[PDB]
Swiss-Prot record, chains A, B:
Gene source species: Bacillus subtilis (strain 168)
Listed result of changing K106N: Loss of activity. Cannot complement E.coli secA mutants
Location of this chain's protein in the cell: Cell membrane; Cytoplasm; Membrane raft
EC number per UniProt: 7.4.2.8
Taxon lineage: Bacteria, Bacillati, Bacillota, Bacilli, Bacillales
Name of this chain's protein: Protein translocase subunit SecA
Record-linked PROSITE patterns: SECA, SECA_MOTOR_DEAD
Cofactor(s) demanded: Zn(2+)
Biological processes annotated in GO: intracellular protein transmembrane transport; protein import; protein targeting; protein transport by the Sec complex
Gene that encodes it: secA
Length: 802, 802
């Protein structure tokens, strides 16, 4: 765009001057492989690998790497990529959104960077919108990879707990946006390291970037499993404890705990009727379920800590004592009070793990994608994925008829014109693609021409193979196809035999979409490789989008000027209007996702903290450093809670502390006032620990030298997992709670952060506390297997919208 | 923080393990300079410079560079920096916020990175909050720089249109956050290249980063000058034109122009009474002022293009024909209609240039800052300045009494306790710093102890030197200082002779602030270098912050428990509450600034486009490539507007186009229908240009071979500037307009973007159009000097708040 306003195309100009050159270097060395045996070529792949760990960077081999591919494809598929293709390739390697007009060869272009990167067995994921496309792709573009001697694994949800590891092992993997996503999640529920399917996320290449990264990313991904019909044992806990109140179950107010060790009259009473002798196994199920109820009676008082109404037990802040915005007590204490207050114990289906697509594709060390429409939603990327959109030239200059919209006053009147258009287009033998927006509108224009005497076929998503198949012959002489919302993305329409002369593929848009791209993709279904074609979008004045944009004035002045009598009518101050209005829709959808990501952004600061810590455990040589560290961690909090800010120097309730450490870490009569009397908190913490460790040793010596590990791993998993799943649900709960009652000075997103982080902190401290206890007071029996933390059926799904 | 929740300190841990090591390498080579002549040392600075353009990177010389400085300071000031200091230095070089507890030696620490970076004469700005501090600093820490043989220039608004260039020339400059900001702006009003004071912004080092980058950055910086009392000639235009309607002033509807060339009966009529013969000089003032009025009558119709009310002439959209959100017609056409419609021609004081601090400090290739409090507003940085906050250790471990807040029921009751505290603190001879929040509160506690019989002194910002001076002796035995809001930032309080034993500096906070930092800075005024001290914040239940946080419940339960009888009272569920509430305030202020920056972010995409283009002109060898390019640019729009989308192939209103190009680019009878008849838009544009250039040549040949340049530069500046200032005001206007009437589907910030960019586009096209015309139809006379674009007085200022 010549003129002062040209400094905007500058950020991409120097980048296009580059890529165009790089592409010249590849075509410059097209001899080094032109006449060379398959063997040596195939061996070039290794010469490369060898050069890599020998100092060279992936970039250093780009020119050649590509060259070899460009060559290999001519052999495998008879296709020698065009400079543009080579250009798109480089872009993809640089980690950008390569926008190449729908009709070039992205599936091929992708081979270049996916290869140059895959040359280090670190993993390369090529993600597609659906399993079919992803399948087909892998097979066809695979031969190229296999030829250069590279393993290519496919990844579908139908593959086994064994197949998928292999598929992910290959140095080049094919999958869908969901599969890769859900796996990441299932990989963090794993009880045994080897159950993890994925490898560390390296480099991703997204085909149809818009669909996957934007559209399909409006809602989050999540796994969950209903809660057992066990609304039987919760009350039992309440009924049991409702008859224990005494100093036979020691309470606590400095640390607010209803511990249980020297409460033998209780730990024995707990055994009213169950496997009394055994602890470890069904004690983690009871204790963790009983204490939460015990604390519901002795610790949590009624109209002071929480409030009750004809709804659920609402919480109450200390300061302004205001009613919390839909929040519950974690670790499963909330529904323990519901038993206490009798109120209906609301049992639901809690969440297990979750992440936003936005956050997923940000994990891979490097990310990139290809499509023919990105500029539309260009700032979305740069902002959320720090990716730039580089628009790559077209193999051959475009000479297609992008006819201006034709506005109509009568809705059911325009269709008569559209239906007629296809009619004559057809009669001349020229092909036609009538794009619609809704099924109701596509079937209407369907029967609308049935009575017109024209053969046709609608596009249903019965299976993308079925759609794809139709599209194939969508450029032949009798062509008349009805595509709902672009039923075939990947499968490109090849002009029919003779169509070149009759004119081209006449694509006619029924209505107009909300975002320019969805119809820019349609409008682009013609003009492949300089092919001649005609696109025309018909637009009504009753079109739901007109009513959505508030174009009532324009609807008036149009009836005030006897216009509704002259069927067709073109106008700038209406088409340049329907676009500016679309931008507003595109600007809102972006605000949404940006609003969505920010909330998840809180979880993603939490997930990693638990995931790295969970994985670290799942896969570890020695686990004592972990477990111990957590203990000393739970001990500081304990000691510290008994030594507030100079409240009576050596006159703290020391005699009490000893009673806590004894019946929580050591044994009924271990620590003595004397052992603490006089030393500062620093010394104390160290001292109390020295006996915790010297005691911890007896465990490795007594019950097992290495059987200990398997003993630790189970309690740290049945803990970390038990709580986490609970917390993840609490977050995916209060997020919607706050949305309502919220007239606080700050904004809701902030409170989420605020209160959220606090919650996250209570769980961590809880995780530690529980861990520190069992590793000590829990003696091993027979069954020493890491036990799951959720009953049977667990589902994988992504919300439709909301 | 030992425990599972330790993975949060990991991002900074590996970074601190590093810097701590780097510091060891410097102290490792402390011999290479320990016993070495001043000459060789001073020469080391050059050995370095020599190594740089010889391949070495700034980092490569870090260890040594620092070493030399560490050494040089021991010589200059007798101070040999501590490892921590060396550590802070590295941080600052890496482009981070070095948070070093208030009391270390940042002003010294800064020397290290400011030196290592300044070793390439690219410029290094060390910005301070006020001119004094910035002054003092430069002098004292300058000796170190001068010693190593480096020029240090100071920068105050009191320096001349010549002094400041020098000051900026030095390889290490000292200034204030405003000076540097305002200069950048004045540097883009410059008519003659050499009037620019600054050099390309290289590396900045901000002392008191919070103050400058955050606080002082809540409001934007801006320059503006009232409009002439010339509400006399606007109406004259209206009165003049109101008697011309005819085909003697050719109108246009395809391009909507009221051009003037072949309108001799008009260009002569224009000369009713003024320097008739002369054009160029007062014609740019008239024509640009007359046509806007002429177009107000012939082109802009009344109740269709714009609406009129008892207010200003509101605009009206084409589509929904809704009332624009406070917008005006740029280039000065808006108030031309006010003449036409008689409505009061609202004359104000328009803006000239403007930028947000946020956007300023982002320009420097690298940025960094130092302070003793950053973690508080930590995410602010990482988010807006992509800077990390690295908390640097303390030279010596801190052993100071951070006593817990003391809540009081009676407001005027707590002061009696506070006033008494200082009283006994004083009587023992120990020093005391009573920090307040408002002047009214500081003077109260002032007279409150006057009647108590205690000597003291309040802190007024009469001049930071006066404040600083007081602070100096604020650690002596009779010390009793009243600081409003930290009257002395830089000047640190050195413990008095003997105070070490009496205890230390007892800092007592009157009230509590909104953001924890402002009082974390206060609380930090003690404990310098492990010094012993006591800090105590007194807090009332009537404290304006309590009322601001909504702590009424807590106010109740406190009177419902006979507490208001026991004067002092400490509590967690109140102090840990006043903090969480403060975070909410800090989270809002951030949202504000983030909201502010985003709006400016639109301008900063516009400023650079005009600034680079303006500077490019201001400083150029040949200007024909520019001017021509703009012409061909204004020509495409012209030709194009006459050749719409296939509207009658060769049957465009061709005969009309010729009439346009003739009386707008060439001459009354130049272009012919024949010359265009048959060729496509591509050919036409090229053809029409070929005569525009071959004609353009006659200008260089006729009036001047190089006098042309000075002819171009004036019209391109009196254009680009005239419009820009107008546009910048329009933006700084409609921003507030939209804020009200706005129930559109999209959010206001979006509309700003939307409509803004559109406006920006009309100005650019206008800039070009005007330029293209004058370069042709304007003949040179005598005065060929670049003329200013604003009358006299122009002010520099930053809004208090809003």
């Amino acid at each position: 765009m010549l003129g002062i306003l040209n400094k905007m195309f500058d950020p991409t100009k120097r980048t296009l001057n580059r890529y165009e050159k790089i592409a010249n270097d590849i075509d410059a060395i097209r001899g080094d492989y032109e006449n060379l045996s398959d063997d040596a070529l195939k061996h070039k792949t290794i010469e490369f690998k060898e050069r890599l760990e020998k100092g060279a960077t992936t970039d250093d081999l780009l020119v050649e790497a590509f060259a070899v591919v460009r060559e290999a494809s001519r052999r495998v598929t008879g296709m020698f990529p065009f400079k543009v293709q080579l250009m798109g390739g480089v872009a993809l390697h640089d980690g950008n959104i390569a926008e190449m007009k729908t009709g070039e060869g992205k599936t091929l272009t992708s081979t270049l960077p996916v290869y140059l990167n895959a040359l280090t067995g670190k993993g390369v994921h090529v993600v597609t919108v659906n399993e079919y496309l992803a399948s087909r792709d892998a097979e066809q573009m695979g031969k190229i990879f296999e030829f250069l001697g590279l393993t290519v694994g496919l990844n579908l949800n139908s593959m086994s707990k064994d197949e998928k590891r292999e598929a992910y092992a290959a140095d080049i993997t094919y999958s869908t946006n969901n599969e890769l996503g859900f796996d990441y999640l299932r990989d963090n529920m794993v009880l045994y390291k080897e159950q993890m399917v994925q490898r560390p996320l390296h480099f991703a290449v997204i085909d149809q970037v818009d669909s996957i990264l934007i559209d399909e990313a409006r809602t989050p991904l999540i796994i969950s499993g209903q809660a057992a019909k066990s609304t039987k044992l919760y009350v039992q806990a309440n009924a049991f404890v409702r008859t224990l109140k005494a100093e036979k179950d020691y309470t606590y107010d400095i640390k607010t705990k209803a511990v249980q060790l020297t409460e033998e009259g209780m730990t024995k009473a707990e055994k009213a009727f169950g496997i009394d002798n055994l602890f470890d196994v069904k004690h983690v199920a009871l204790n963790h379920h009983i204490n939460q109820a015990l604390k519901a009676h002795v610790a949590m008082q009624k109209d002071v800590d929480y409030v009750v109404e004809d709804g659920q037990v609402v919480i109450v802040d200390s300061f302004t004592g205001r009613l919390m915005k839909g929040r519950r007590y974690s670790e499963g204490l909330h529904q323990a009070i519901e038993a206490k207050e009798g109120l209906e114990i609301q049992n639901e289906s809690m969440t297990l793990a979750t992440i936003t697509f936005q956050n997923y594709f940000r994990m891979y060390e490097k990310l990139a994608g290809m499509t023919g429409t990105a500029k539309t939603e260009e700032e979305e990327f740069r902002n959320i994925y720090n990716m730039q959109v580089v628009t790559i030239p077209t193999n051959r200059p475009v000479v297609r008829d992008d006819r201006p919209d034709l506005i109509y006053r009568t809705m059911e009147g325009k269709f008569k014109a559209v239906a007629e258009d296809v009619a004559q287009r057809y009669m001349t033998g020229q092909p036609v693609l009538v794009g619609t927006v809704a099924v109701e509108t596509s079937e209407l224009i369907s029967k609308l021409l049935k009575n017109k005497g024209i053969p046709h076929q609608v596009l249903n998503a019965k299976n993308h193979e079925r759609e794809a198949q139709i599209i194939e012959e969508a450029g032949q002489k009798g062509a008349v196809t009805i595509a709902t919302n672009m039923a075939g993305r990947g499968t490109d329409i090849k002009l029919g035999e003779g169509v070149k002369e009759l004119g081209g593929l006449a694509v006619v848009g029924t209505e107009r979409h909300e975002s320019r791209r969805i119809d820019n993709q349609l409008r682009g279904r013609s003009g492949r490789q300089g092919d001649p074609g005609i696109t025309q979008f018909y637009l009504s004045m009753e079109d739901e989008l007109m009513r959505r944009f508030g174009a009532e004035r324009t609807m008036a002045m149009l009836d005030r000027f006897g216009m509704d009598d002259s069927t067709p009518i073109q106008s700038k101050m209406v088409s340049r209007a329907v676009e500016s209005s679309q931008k507003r829709v595109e600007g809102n959808n972006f605000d949404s996702r940006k609003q969505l990501l920010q909330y998840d952004d809180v979880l993603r600061q939490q997930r990693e903290v638990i995931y790295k810590q969970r994985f670290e455990v799942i896969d570890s040589e020695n686990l004592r450093e972990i477990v111990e560290n957590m203990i000393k961690s739970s001990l500081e909090r304990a000691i510290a809670a008994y030594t507030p800010r100079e409240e009576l120097p050596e006159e703290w309730k020391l005699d009490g502390l000893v009673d806590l450490i004894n019946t929580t870490y050591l044994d009924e009569g271990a620590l003595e006032k004397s052992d603490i009397f006089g030393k500062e908190p620093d010394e104390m913490l160290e001292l109390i620990m020295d006996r915790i460790i010297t005691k911890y040793n007896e465990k490795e010596e007594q019950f097992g030298k290495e059987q200990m590990r398997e003993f630790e791993k189970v309690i740290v998993l049945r803990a970390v997992d038990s709580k986490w799943m609970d917390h993840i649900d609490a977050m995916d709960q209060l997020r919607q709670g706050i949305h309502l009652r919220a007239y606080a000075q700050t904004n809701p997103l902030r409170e989420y952060q605020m209160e959220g982080f606090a919650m996250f902190e209570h769980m961590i401290e809880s995780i530690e506390d529980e861990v520190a206890k069992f590793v000590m007071k829990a003696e091993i029996e027979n069954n020493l297997e890491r036990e799951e933390v959720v009953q049977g059926q667990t589902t994988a799904h992504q919300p439709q919208e909301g």
